[PDB]
Structure 1
Amino acid sequence: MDIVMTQSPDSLAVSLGERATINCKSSQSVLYSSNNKNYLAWYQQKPGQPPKLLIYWASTRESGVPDRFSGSGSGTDFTLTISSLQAEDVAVYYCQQYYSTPLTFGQGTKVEIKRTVAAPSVFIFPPSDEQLKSGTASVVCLLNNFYPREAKVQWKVDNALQSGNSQESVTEQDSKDSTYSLSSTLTLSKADYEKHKVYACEVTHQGLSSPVTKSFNRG
């Protein structure tokens, strides 16, 4: 008899300025007879941050929340609408009932922007002299502000393709230009690093006409 909250869809992506619609269904009614209020809230959550309250009583906007955010519904069926999706609106959105304990949340709905293709700017970074003291070398490749998220990094050392000795991660969608960024690190022993000359990061992305290589010569 815990109230289960189910959101639909799980993920959406629309173009800048298009409407975004997030639905939430409760397994029991959250409409309270004695005051005719729905005990239902909506939250926005961005990476690294706590959730932020947008809507309560199903349709009351929290103070400070932009007009483009609107809550609707009664009983068991609710909807958060963003009338004109802005770049800064990319986030995960959650519904919550507080009709009864335990307080329960929907699973979250990820909201992203669809935009034109953008090629990355690419940068390569040699290991620092201070790190080399440790006996390990990290070579870093940065792909700055690209769209869509799909990208491939290939490391080459003296034109030899590297495998198994790199790791990468990718940022969440940028709140201003709706791009992604990616960092890749190649890890070698100092010995291996000192044995070779040409360190290259080869980047494939659909915004580029052909793969772009950034490189340096050790020393």
Structure 2
Amino acid sequence: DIVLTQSPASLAVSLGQRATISCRASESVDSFMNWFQQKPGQPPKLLIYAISNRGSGVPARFSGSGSGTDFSLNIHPVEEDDPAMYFCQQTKEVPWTFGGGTKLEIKRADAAPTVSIFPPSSEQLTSGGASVVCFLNNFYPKDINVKWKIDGSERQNGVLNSWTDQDSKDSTYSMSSTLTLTKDEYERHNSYTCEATHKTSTSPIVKSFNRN
């Protein structure tokens, strides 16, 4: 069973630059080496086959090279629409195998999140539950911390966070943070706050509401 190893795991490159992803095969492959591109919500798509031939429909921006054990994919110029998961594949012989996959992220200027906080809807309250939602949309870089505060005091439990893949238009990220409490807990406090602390500004962006 041949084994493919890609590097790096993740790759961040500025617009226009050159993208280089590598894959090393534990055994010969003769030239059965191909590369696939997979964008979120989509199935993998054939980029390069026989290590140098671009797939019918693939733009010149892409190209692969190498020989023997390891090969590599090169994108240049890297565009806004390139962030994705890239995998190399071996078809020389059964069982066919795939590289572990490598995530390509575009690099852009910092961007502050547009923050929105939402109180629990009356419907959820009627059923004894209370989820407070906060959205941090279109920011950059991806790493950012969210802190919840109830009546001024930080809450740790009941928080679920979720990040979206990088936007393929403005190259930003978006994130959701949900603080789920019980109706009774909710009714015992009045002020709820969502705080986004980044690094591109260690000055937090806050949003909050009062139950009354």
Normalised by the shorter chain, which TM-score bucket? over 0.9
Tell me, in whole angstroms, the C-alpha distance in 1 between the residues paired with 2:114 and 2:74: 35
Determine if the alignment matches structure 1 residue 162 to structure 2 residue 155: yes
Determine if the alignment matches structure 1 residue 93 to structure 2 residue 86: yes
Other structure's SS at 2:85 match = strand
Aligned match of 1:196 in 169, 183, 189?
189
What is the aligned partner in structure 1 of residue 5 from structure 2?
A: 6
Determine if the alignment matches structure 1 residue 115 to structure 2 residue 108: yes
**Deviation larger for 194-203 or 204-213:** 204-213
What is the aligned partner in structure 2 of residue 58 from structure 1?
A: 51
- What are the superposed Cα offsets for residues 41-65 of structure 1, whole Å, 9 maximum, x if unpaired? 1101123322111111111111111
Which TM-score applies when normalising by structure 1? Answer: 0.91
CA shift at 1:135, angstroms?
0.5
Aligned match of 2:144 in 148, 151, 169?
151
Runs (5+) with no aligned partner, structure 1: 32-37
**Deviation larger for 46-55 or 206-215:** 206-215
Other structure's SS at 2:171 match = coil
CA contact (8 A) 1:120 1:207 kept: no
Other structure's SS at 1:63 match = coil
What is the aligned partner in structure 1 of residue 21 from structure 2?
A: 22
What is the aligned partner in structure 2 of residue 67 from structure 1?
A: 60
Other structure's SS at 1:87 match = coil
**Deviation larger for 91-100 or 38-47:** 38-47
What is the aligned partner in structure 2 of residue 78 from structure 1?
A: 71
Aligned match of 1:177 in 167, 170, 182?
170
Aligned length: 212
Other structure's SS at 2:81 match = helix
Matched-pair identity in %? 63
Q: AA paired with 1:96?
A: Q
Other structure's SS at 1:132 match = helix
- What are the superposed Cα offsets for residues 84-121 of structure 1, whole Å, 9 maximum, x if unpaired? 11121111111111111010111112211122111111
Q: AA paired with 1:193?
A: Y
